[PDB]
Amino acid sequence: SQIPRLSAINDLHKIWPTVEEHGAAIIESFLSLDIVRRLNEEVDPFVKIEPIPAAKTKDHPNHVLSTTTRLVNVLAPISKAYREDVLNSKVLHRICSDAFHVYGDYWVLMGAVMELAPSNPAQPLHRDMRFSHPIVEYLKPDAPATSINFLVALSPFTAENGATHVILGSHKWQNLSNVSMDATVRALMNPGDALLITDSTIHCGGAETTGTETRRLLTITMGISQLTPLESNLAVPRPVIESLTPLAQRLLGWASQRSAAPRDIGLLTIRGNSIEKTMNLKAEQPL
């Protein structure tokens, strides 16, 4: 049984129901190739200078990722394509509002480019969020997913170059005794395609077997606004913030947030008023 493949335009309403049922779907042409090109060009130098995940100069080293992984997050100050095109993706927002409506507003838990060096080994099969949000393990097993992960190919995903592994249905597994690479299927994808999984989907990056190809992806973990993002936009220059849409501002933590509770009293408010109202935060002011 293979990962279902859906069109970003044609099949839009089918995407989240497909993930909710099977734990994974491939969104074909999630980002256009022109956006992929621009993202790539804009993040390239930051990828090249990024040290190892656990670099000694970091005061929050990532000890989990392999030394042949590079991960660059807080993309808004680096990439116009990301902060305009990606953060405003209609497809992305329709899926997130489909996924998160029971909880409320959602935001970017982390937007990162990952680049894997040739011969990068397969990651251990895993669910996300367990090195950041242990609260998630305490959720009842039937609780709606509180985060999801769009793994967007910025270069080709093939079985040979380490395309992601997923276990279909594994987001509903309580008993993990059956986890093995035996149960996986691959996300074979063209640049701009996205693999969409939930925080309970068991998955892993694949083994890069060519010894030559450098695989790159954009991972967008979207999560309910009641959960703290893994990354901070607090240091993004205010001019950059004020060039965004209000929606993009909210996604980066530069706006207040709402839950779905009928009498919701809000998140990140100030004596009854929003961040953006208190600070008189402008939007869509070009640089």
Ligand X SMILES: CN1C(=O)c2ccccc2NC(=O)[C@@H]1Cc1ccccc1
Q: Which amino acid, residue 200?
A: S
Query: Among 32-40, 60-68, 134-142, 170-178, which window interacts with ligand X (CB under 6 A)?
Result: 60-68
Q: Residue 112 binds which one of ligand AKG, Fe ion, ligand X, none, with CB within 5 to 8 A depending on kind? A: ligand X
Q: Which amino acid, residue 136?
A: V
CB of 195 to Fe ion, least distance (A): 10
Instruction: Show binding-site residues for Fe cation.
Output: 126, 128, 203
Q: Residue 151 binds which one of ligand AKG, Fe ion, ligand X, none, with CB within 5 to 8 A depending on kind? A: ligand AKG
CA atoms of 147 and 128, how far apart (whole Å) = 9
CA atoms of 137 and 176, how far apart (whole Å) = 14
Q: Tell me: does residue 193 bind Fe ion (CB under 5 A).
A: no
Helix (H, G, I), strand (E, B) or coil at 251: helix
Cβ distance to Fe ion smaller for residue 132 or 259: 132
Q: Which two tokens stand for residue 96?
A: 């997130």
Which of 192, 195, 184 lies closest to 221 in space, CA to CA?
Answer: 195
Report 91-150 residues binding ligand X (CB under 6 A). 110, 112, 123-124, 126, 128-131
Report 206-245 residues binding ligand X (CB under 6 A). 219, 221
Query: Among 77-85, 135-143, 202-210, 259-267, which window interacts with ligand AKG (CB under 6 A)?
Result: 202-210
* Contact between residue 229 and residue 147 where contact means Cβ atoms under 8 Å apart: no
Q: Tell me: does residue 257 bind ligand AKG (CB under 6 A).
A: no
The pairing of strands 147-153 and 215-224 is antiparallel
Q: Tell me: does residue 62 bind ligand X (CB under 6 A).
A: yes
CA atoms of 214 and 208, how far apart (whole Å) = 8
Instruction: Show binding-site residues.
Output: 126, 128, 203
Q: Tell me: does residue 167 bind ligand AKG (CB under 6 A).
A: no
Report 89-128 residues binding Fe ion (CB under 5 A). 128
**Torsion, Cα of 51, 52, 58, 60 (10° steps):** 140
Task: Using CB under 5 A, list all residues that contact Fe ion.
Answer: 128
